[PDB]
Enzyme design. Sequence first.
Site, PDB file in Angstrom:
ATOM      1  N   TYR A 185      16.564  -0.391   0.993  1.00 40.12           N
ATOM      2  CA  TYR A 185      15.228  -0.707   1.068  1.00 40.12           C
ATOM      3  C   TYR A 185      14.428  -0.252   0.030  1.00 40.12           C
ATOM      4  O   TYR A 185      14.140   0.947  -0.050  1.00 40.12           O
ATOM      5  CB  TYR A 185      14.523  -0.598   2.484  1.00 40.12           C
ATOM      6  N   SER A 222       3.994  -3.552   3.425  1.00 38.51           N
ATOM      7  CA  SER A 222       5.282  -4.350   3.195  1.00 38.51           C
ATOM      8  C   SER A 222       5.464  -5.723   3.690  1.00 38.51           C
ATOM      9  O   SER A 222       6.184  -6.428   3.358  1.00 38.51           O
ATOM     10  CB  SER A 222       6.628  -3.387   3.616  1.00 38.51           C
TER      11      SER A 222
HETATM   12  B1  LIG Z   1       6.396  -0.878   3.256  1.00 41.08           B
HETATM   13  O1  LIG Z   1       5.437  -0.966   4.056  1.00 41.08           O
HETATM   14  O2  LIG Z   1       7.682  -0.655   4.210  1.00 41.08           O
HETATM   15  C1  LIG Z   1       6.282   0.042   2.118  1.00 41.08           C
HETATM   16  C2  LIG Z   1       4.968   0.233   1.314  1.00 41.08           C
HETATM   17  C3  LIG Z   1       4.704   0.999   0.467  1.00 41.08           C
HETATM   18  C4  LIG Z   1       5.537   1.967   0.008  1.00 41.08           C
HETATM   19  C5  LIG Z   1       5.595   3.073  -0.931  1.00 41.08           C
HETATM   20  C6  LIG Z   1       4.315   3.211  -1.603  1.00 41.08           C
HETATM   21  C7  LIG Z   1       4.265   4.277  -2.655  1.00 41.08           C
HETATM   22  O3  LIG Z   1       4.408   4.085  -4.017  1.00 41.08           O
HETATM   23  O4  LIG Z   1       4.301   5.456  -2.167  1.00 41.08           O
HETATM   24  C8  LIG Z   1       6.866   2.082   0.837  1.00 41.08           C
HETATM   25  C9  LIG Z   1       7.062   0.967   1.791  1.00 41.08           C
END
Ligand SMILES: *[B]([O])([O])C1=[C][C]=C(/[C]=[C]/C([O])=O)[C]=[C]1
Length: 358
Positions: A147, A61
Amino acid sequence: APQQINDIVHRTITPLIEQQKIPGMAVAVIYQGKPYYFTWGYADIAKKQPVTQQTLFELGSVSKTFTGVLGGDAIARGEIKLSDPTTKYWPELTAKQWNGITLLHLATYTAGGLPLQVPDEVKSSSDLLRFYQNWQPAWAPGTQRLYANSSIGLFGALAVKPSGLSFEQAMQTRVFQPLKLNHTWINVPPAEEKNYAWGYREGKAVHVSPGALDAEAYGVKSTIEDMARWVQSNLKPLDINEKTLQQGIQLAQSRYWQTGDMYQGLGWEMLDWPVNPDSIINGSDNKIALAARPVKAITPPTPAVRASWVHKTGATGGFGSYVAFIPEKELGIVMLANKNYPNPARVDAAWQILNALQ
Ligand SMILES: *[B]([O])([O])C1=[C][C]=C(/[C]=[C]/C([O])=O)[C]=[C]1
Protein backbone atom coordinates in the site's frame (compact mmCIF):
# COMPACT_ATOMS: atom_id res chain seq x y z
CA ALA A 1 -35.36 8.06 8.84
CA PRO A 2 -37.04 4.67 9.47
CA GLN A 3 -36.74 3.82 13.16
CA GLN A 4 -34.82 0.66 12.26
CA ILE A 5 -31.97 2.61 10.68
CA ASN A 6 -32.08 5.25 13.41
CA ASP A 7 -31.80 2.65 16.17
CA ILE A 8 -28.97 0.55 14.71
CA VAL A 9 -27.02 3.66 13.77
CA HIS A 10 -27.36 5.25 17.23
CA ARG A 11 -26.87 1.97 19.13
CA THR A 12 -23.62 1.46 17.23
CA ILE A 13 -22.10 4.95 16.80
CA THR A 14 -22.85 6.30 20.26
CA PRO A 15 -20.60 3.85 22.13
CA LEU A 16 -17.98 4.30 19.39
CA ILE A 17 -17.83 8.06 19.91
CA GLU A 18 -17.40 7.64 23.65
CA GLN A 19 -14.83 4.83 23.56
CA GLN A 20 -12.66 6.52 20.90
CA LYS A 21 -13.20 10.06 22.22
CA ILE A 22 -14.35 11.32 18.85
CA PRO A 23 -14.99 15.12 18.98
CA GLY A 24 -17.20 15.25 15.92
CA MET A 25 -18.75 12.86 13.48
CA ALA A 26 -21.06 12.49 10.49
CA VAL A 27 -22.58 9.28 9.19
CA ALA A 28 -24.58 8.46 6.12
CA VAL A 29 -26.42 5.23 5.40
CA ILE A 30 -27.59 4.57 1.87
CA TYR A 31 -30.56 2.24 2.20
CA GLN A 32 -32.39 1.04 -0.89
CA GLY A 33 -30.73 3.84 -2.83
CA LYS A 34 -31.86 6.59 -0.39
CA PRO A 35 -29.50 8.50 1.96
CA TYR A 36 -30.03 9.02 5.68
CA TYR A 37 -27.83 11.38 7.69
CA PHE A 38 -26.59 11.59 11.24
CA THR A 39 -24.26 14.00 13.02
CA TRP A 40 -22.62 14.30 16.42
CA GLY A 41 -20.39 16.70 18.29
CA TYR A 42 -18.00 19.34 17.06
CA ALA A 43 -16.35 20.46 13.88
CA ASP A 44 -14.49 23.09 15.91
CA ILE A 45 -14.22 22.61 19.67
CA ALA A 46 -12.81 26.07 20.45
CA LYS A 47 -15.41 28.01 18.42
CA LYS A 48 -18.24 25.60 19.40
CA GLN A 49 -19.22 24.93 15.77
CA PRO A 50 -21.25 21.70 15.55
CA VAL A 51 -20.84 19.02 12.90
CA THR A 52 -23.61 19.47 10.33
CA GLN A 53 -24.35 17.86 6.95
CA GLN A 54 -22.42 20.71 5.35
CA THR A 55 -19.23 20.19 7.41
CA LEU A 56 -16.15 19.32 5.36
CA PHE A 57 -13.89 16.54 6.59
CA GLU A 58 -10.49 15.49 5.31
CA LEU A 59 -11.07 12.19 3.49
CA GLY A 60 -7.46 11.12 3.71
CA SER A 61 -6.79 8.01 1.61
CA VAL A 62 -10.50 7.67 0.68
CA SER A 63 -9.35 10.26 -1.89
CA LYS A 64 -7.62 7.26 -3.57
CA THR A 65 -11.06 6.04 -4.66
CA PHE A 66 -11.60 9.31 -6.55
CA THR A 67 -8.21 8.85 -8.16
CA GLY A 68 -9.06 5.26 -9.14
CA VAL A 69 -12.25 6.43 -10.89
CA LEU A 70 -10.64 9.45 -12.58
CA GLY A 71 -8.03 7.00 -13.80
CA GLY A 72 -10.66 4.57 -15.00
CA ASP A 73 -12.40 7.41 -16.79
CA ALA A 74 -9.14 8.18 -18.63
CA ILE A 75 -8.97 4.53 -19.67
CA ALA A 76 -12.58 4.54 -20.92
CA ARG A 77 -11.70 7.67 -22.93
CA GLY A 78 -8.80 5.83 -24.55
CA GLU A 79 -6.31 8.37 -23.16
CA ILE A 80 -4.33 5.72 -21.23
CA LYS A 81 -4.15 1.92 -20.89
CA LEU A 82 -3.31 0.07 -17.70
CA SER A 83 -1.07 -2.16 -19.81
CA ASP A 84 1.10 0.80 -20.93
CA PRO A 85 4.54 1.08 -19.35
CA THR A 86 5.07 3.92 -16.88
CA THR A 87 7.62 5.46 -19.27
CA LYS A 88 5.07 6.05 -22.05
CA TYR A 89 3.85 9.09 -20.05
CA TRP A 90 7.13 10.04 -18.38
CA PRO A 91 9.96 9.34 -20.87
CA GLU A 92 12.23 11.31 -18.56
CA LEU A 93 12.07 8.23 -16.30
CA THR A 94 15.06 6.40 -17.75
CA ALA A 95 16.40 4.39 -14.78
CA LYS A 96 16.33 0.72 -15.86
CA GLN A 97 14.36 -0.48 -12.86
CA TRP A 98 11.27 1.06 -14.54
CA ASN A 99 11.16 -1.22 -17.63
CA GLY A 100 8.26 -3.62 -17.08
CA ILE A 101 6.51 -1.40 -14.49
CA THR A 102 3.07 -0.55 -15.91
CA LEU A 103 0.34 1.94 -15.00
CA LEU A 104 -1.51 -1.10 -13.56
CA HIS A 105 1.37 -1.64 -11.12
CA LEU A 106 1.26 2.01 -9.96
CA ALA A 107 -2.52 1.96 -9.64
CA THR A 108 -2.46 -1.25 -7.62
CA TYR A 109 0.59 -0.81 -5.36
CA THR A 110 2.36 -3.68 -7.17
CA ALA A 111 5.35 -1.92 -8.76
CA GLY A 112 7.77 -3.75 -6.49
CA GLY A 113 8.01 -1.74 -3.30
CA LEU A 114 7.28 1.95 -3.94
CA PRO A 115 7.17 3.46 -0.44
CA LEU A 116 4.06 4.50 1.49
CA GLN A 117 5.19 8.06 1.97
CA VAL A 118 6.82 10.33 -0.56
CA PRO A 119 9.69 11.99 1.40
CA ASP A 120 9.20 15.49 2.87
CA GLU A 121 12.28 16.60 0.95
CA VAL A 122 10.42 15.93 -2.30
CA LYS A 123 8.68 19.24 -3.05
CA SER A 124 9.19 20.00 -6.76
CA SER A 125 8.76 18.50 -10.21
CA SER A 126 12.52 17.86 -10.41
CA ASP A 127 12.63 16.37 -6.91
CA LEU A 128 9.90 13.98 -7.79
CA LEU A 129 11.66 12.82 -10.96
CA ARG A 130 14.86 12.33 -8.99
CA PHE A 131 13.02 10.40 -6.29
CA TYR A 132 11.65 7.85 -8.81
CA GLN A 133 14.89 7.63 -10.80
CA ASN A 134 16.71 6.72 -7.57
CA TRP A 135 14.14 4.29 -6.12
CA GLN A 136 15.22 0.65 -5.93
CA PRO A 137 12.51 -2.01 -6.23
CA ALA A 138 12.88 -4.78 -3.69
CA TRP A 139 10.81 -7.16 -5.86
CA ALA A 140 10.03 -7.82 -9.49
CA PRO A 141 6.90 -6.05 -10.76
CA GLY A 142 3.48 -7.56 -10.15
CA THR A 143 4.62 -9.91 -7.34
CA GLN A 144 3.91 -8.11 -4.10
CA ARG A 145 1.46 -5.52 -2.85
CA LEU A 146 2.69 -2.64 -0.66
CA TYR A 147 0.00 0.00 0.00
CA ALA A 148 1.63 3.25 -1.12
CA ASN A 149 0.94 6.95 -1.78
CA SER A 150 3.97 7.13 -4.03
CA SER A 151 2.51 4.31 -6.10
CA ILE A 152 -1.15 5.34 -6.75
CA GLY A 153 -0.21 9.02 -6.45
CA LEU A 154 2.07 8.69 -9.47
CA PHE A 155 -0.68 6.77 -11.26
CA GLY A 156 -3.03 9.66 -10.72
CA ALA A 157 -0.55 12.22 -11.98
CA LEU A 158 0.43 10.31 -15.11
CA ALA A 159 -3.16 9.34 -15.90
CA VAL A 160 -4.35 12.92 -16.50
CA LYS A 161 -1.34 13.78 -18.70
CA PRO A 162 -2.98 13.18 -22.08
CA SER A 163 -6.04 15.23 -21.08
CA GLY A 164 -3.77 18.25 -20.88
CA LEU A 165 -5.63 19.16 -17.70
CA SER A 166 -4.20 19.61 -14.22
CA PHE A 167 -5.09 16.80 -11.81
CA GLU A 168 -7.47 19.06 -9.86
CA GLN A 169 -9.06 20.35 -13.06
CA ALA A 170 -9.51 16.86 -14.49
CA MET A 171 -11.05 15.79 -11.18
CA GLN A 172 -13.44 18.77 -10.99
CA THR A 173 -14.49 18.51 -14.61
CA ARG A 174 -14.68 14.74 -15.05
CA VAL A 175 -15.79 13.47 -11.66
CA PHE A 176 -17.01 16.06 -9.10
CA GLN A 177 -19.13 18.13 -11.51
CA PRO A 178 -20.92 15.34 -13.47
CA LEU A 179 -21.74 13.73 -10.12
CA LYS A 180 -22.80 17.06 -8.56
CA LEU A 181 -20.30 16.74 -5.73
CA ASN A 182 -20.33 20.57 -5.39
CA HIS A 183 -18.90 20.67 -1.89
CA THR A 184 -15.96 18.37 -2.50
CA TRP A 185 -12.52 19.93 -2.82
CA ILE A 186 -8.82 19.26 -3.32
CA ASN A 187 -8.25 22.90 -2.22
CA VAL A 188 -10.85 24.39 0.13
CA PRO A 189 -11.86 27.85 -1.15
CA PRO A 190 -12.02 30.84 1.27
CA ALA A 191 -15.84 30.94 1.04
CA GLU A 192 -16.01 27.36 2.40
CA GLU A 193 -13.49 27.63 5.22
CA LYS A 194 -16.38 28.14 7.62
CA ASN A 195 -17.55 24.52 7.13
CA TYR A 196 -14.04 23.04 7.32
CA ALA A 197 -13.82 20.99 10.51
CA TRP A 198 -10.54 20.98 12.39
CA GLY A 199 -8.82 17.63 12.74
CA TYR A 200 -7.83 16.61 16.25
CA ARG A 201 -4.62 14.83 17.14
CA GLU A 202 -3.49 14.55 20.75
CA GLY A 203 -6.01 17.27 21.58
CA LYS A 204 -4.53 19.84 19.21
CA ALA A 205 -6.41 21.16 16.14
CA VAL A 206 -4.75 20.29 12.85
CA HIS A 207 -5.23 20.32 9.08
CA VAL A 208 -3.35 18.19 6.56
CA SER A 209 -0.01 19.76 5.46
CA PRO A 210 0.88 20.15 1.79
CA GLY A 211 3.04 17.43 0.24
CA ALA A 212 4.03 15.84 -3.05
CA LEU A 213 1.23 13.93 -4.76
CA ASP A 214 -1.10 14.95 -1.95
CA ALA A 215 -4.05 15.74 -4.20
CA GLU A 216 -3.65 12.39 -5.96
CA ALA A 217 -3.26 10.34 -2.78
CA TYR A 218 -5.00 11.82 0.25
CA GLY A 219 -5.97 15.43 -0.46
CA VAL A 220 -9.77 15.49 -0.88
CA LYS A 221 -12.16 17.12 1.64
CA SER A 222 -15.92 16.51 1.47
CA THR A 223 -19.28 16.66 3.27
CA ILE A 224 -21.43 13.79 4.40
CA GLU A 225 -23.93 14.71 1.66
CA ASP A 226 -21.42 14.59 -1.19
CA MET A 227 -19.88 11.36 0.20
CA ALA A 228 -23.33 9.72 0.41
CA ARG A 229 -23.71 10.76 -3.19
CA TRP A 230 -20.26 9.40 -4.07
CA VAL A 231 -21.41 6.09 -2.53
CA GLN A 232 -24.69 5.98 -4.51
CA SER A 233 -22.68 6.60 -7.70
CA ASN A 234 -20.40 3.66 -7.04
CA LEU A 235 -23.33 1.47 -6.01
CA LYS A 236 -25.21 2.13 -9.25
CA PRO A 237 -22.84 3.36 -11.99
CA LEU A 238 -25.34 2.60 -14.76
CA ASP A 239 -27.32 5.63 -13.53
CA ILE A 240 -24.37 7.85 -14.41
CA ASN A 241 -25.23 9.40 -17.78
CA GLU A 242 -21.63 10.29 -18.71
CA LYS A 243 -20.41 7.23 -20.58
CA THR A 244 -16.66 7.24 -19.85
CA LEU A 245 -17.29 7.98 -16.14
CA GLN A 246 -19.80 5.14 -15.91
CA GLN A 247 -17.12 2.82 -17.37
CA GLY A 248 -14.47 4.36 -15.13
CA ILE A 249 -16.46 3.56 -12.03
CA GLN A 250 -16.93 -0.03 -13.20
CA LEU A 251 -13.26 -0.30 -13.96
CA ALA A 252 -12.27 0.79 -10.46
CA GLN A 253 -14.26 -2.08 -8.99
CA SER A 254 -12.72 -4.71 -11.23
CA ARG A 255 -10.56 -7.29 -9.42
CA TYR A 256 -6.93 -7.06 -10.52
CA TRP A 257 -5.08 -8.86 -7.74
CA GLN A 258 -5.93 -11.02 -4.78
CA THR A 259 -4.12 -11.21 -1.47
CA GLY A 260 -5.69 -13.35 1.21
CA ASP A 261 -9.41 -12.89 0.70
CA MET A 262 -9.03 -9.33 -0.50
CA TYR A 263 -9.09 -8.07 -4.09
CA GLN A 264 -7.35 -4.91 -5.27
CA GLY A 265 -9.31 -2.56 -7.49
CA LEU A 266 -8.33 0.94 -8.59
CA GLY A 267 -8.46 2.68 -5.21
CA TRP A 268 -11.30 0.53 -3.87
CA GLU A 269 -10.58 -2.82 -2.19
CA MET A 270 -13.24 -5.55 -2.45
CA LEU A 271 -14.13 -8.81 -0.71
CA ASP A 272 -16.79 -11.35 -1.63
CA TRP A 273 -20.06 -10.88 0.21
CA PRO A 274 -21.29 -12.33 2.40
CA VAL A 275 -18.02 -11.51 4.08
CA ASN A 276 -16.60 -12.53 7.42
CA PRO A 277 -16.36 -9.56 9.85
CA ASP A 278 -13.08 -10.71 11.44
CA SER A 279 -11.71 -10.98 7.93
CA ILE A 280 -12.54 -7.37 7.05
CA ILE A 281 -12.11 -6.11 10.59
CA ASN A 282 -8.80 -7.78 11.45
CA GLY A 283 -7.84 -7.27 7.81
CA SER A 284 -8.21 -3.47 8.02
CA ASP A 285 -5.80 -3.03 10.98
CA ASN A 286 -2.56 -1.17 10.13
CA LYS A 287 -0.64 -4.43 10.58
CA ILE A 288 -2.22 -6.20 7.60
CA ALA A 289 -3.35 -3.33 5.37
CA LEU A 290 0.10 -1.70 5.15
CA ALA A 291 2.26 -4.88 5.22
CA ALA A 292 4.16 -6.41 2.31
CA ARG A 293 2.12 -9.21 0.69
CA PRO A 294 2.37 -11.46 -2.38
CA VAL A 295 -0.39 -11.14 -4.91
CA LYS A 296 -1.91 -13.53 -7.37
CA ALA A 297 -2.79 -11.85 -10.64
CA ILE A 298 -6.41 -12.13 -11.78
CA THR A 299 -5.89 -12.88 -15.46
CA PRO A 300 -7.88 -11.29 -16.89
CA PRO A 301 -9.43 -9.03 -14.23
CA THR A 302 -12.91 -9.97 -13.05
CA PRO A 303 -15.43 -7.19 -13.90
CA ALA A 304 -17.06 -5.51 -10.90
CA VAL A 305 -18.81 -8.18 -8.74
CA ARG A 306 -22.20 -6.95 -7.39
CA ALA A 307 -22.07 -9.41 -4.48
CA SER A 308 -19.13 -7.60 -2.87
CA TRP A 309 -18.22 -5.50 0.11
CA VAL A 310 -16.41 -2.58 -1.50
CA HIS A 311 -14.56 -0.33 0.89
CA LYS A 312 -11.70 1.96 1.84
CA THR A 313 -10.30 3.48 4.98
CA GLY A 314 -8.71 6.93 5.06
CA ALA A 315 -6.76 8.97 7.57
CA THR A 316 -4.87 12.19 8.01
CA GLY A 317 -3.09 13.22 11.20
CA GLY A 318 -6.41 14.66 12.38
CA PHE A 319 -9.10 12.69 10.52
CA GLY A 320 -10.45 9.16 10.27
CA SER A 321 -12.84 8.21 7.50
CA TYR A 322 -14.38 5.05 6.05
CA VAL A 323 -16.63 4.10 3.13
CA ALA A 324 -18.20 0.67 2.61
CA PHE A 325 -20.95 -0.51 0.29
CA ILE A 326 -22.68 -3.65 -1.07
CA PRO A 327 -23.93 -3.09 -4.68
CA GLU A 328 -26.11 -6.17 -4.66
CA LYS A 329 -28.05 -4.87 -1.65
CA GLU A 330 -28.10 -1.20 -2.68
CA LEU A 331 -26.58 -0.66 0.74
CA GLY A 332 -23.77 1.58 1.95
CA ILE A 333 -22.34 3.70 4.73
CA VAL A 334 -20.01 6.70 5.06
CA MET A 335 -18.29 7.51 8.37
CA LEU A 336 -16.35 10.81 8.67
CA ALA A 337 -14.64 11.88 11.90
CA ASN A 338 -12.18 14.57 12.98
CA LYS A 339 -9.89 12.26 14.96
CA ASN A 340 -7.90 9.42 13.46
CA TYR A 341 -9.05 6.35 15.35
CA PRO A 342 -8.22 2.59 14.91
CA ASN A 343 -9.36 1.10 11.58
CA PRO A 344 -10.85 -2.07 13.16
CA ALA A 345 -13.27 0.00 15.19
CA ARG A 346 -14.52 1.71 12.00
CA VAL A 347 -15.01 -1.51 10.05
CA ASP A 348 -16.59 -3.15 13.13
CA ALA A 349 -19.14 -0.34 13.47
CA ALA A 350 -19.83 -0.29 9.73
CA TRP A 351 -20.36 -4.02 9.60
CA GLN A 352 -22.68 -4.03 12.65
CA ILE A 353 -24.83 -1.41 10.88
CA LEU A 354 -24.95 -2.87 7.39
CA ASN A 355 -25.30 -6.51 8.38
CA ALA A 356 -28.31 -5.44 10.44
CA LEU A 357 -30.03 -4.29 7.22
CA GLN A 358 -29.51 -7.53 5.18
B1 LIG B 1 -4.19 6.92 3.87
O1 LIG B 1 -5.18 7.59 4.74
O2 LIG B 1 -4.09 5.47 4.25
C1 LIG B 1 -2.81 7.63 4.05
C2 LIG B 1 -2.73 9.02 3.93
C3 LIG B 1 -1.52 9.69 4.10
C4 LIG B 1 -0.35 8.93 4.41
C5 LIG B 1 0.96 9.54 4.63
C6 LIG B 1 1.20 10.87 4.55
C7 LIG B 1 2.55 11.36 4.79
O3 LIG B 1 3.27 11.88 3.78
O4 LIG B 1 3.05 11.29 5.91
C8 LIG B 1 -0.48 7.52 4.52
C9 LIG B 1 -1.68 6.91 4.34
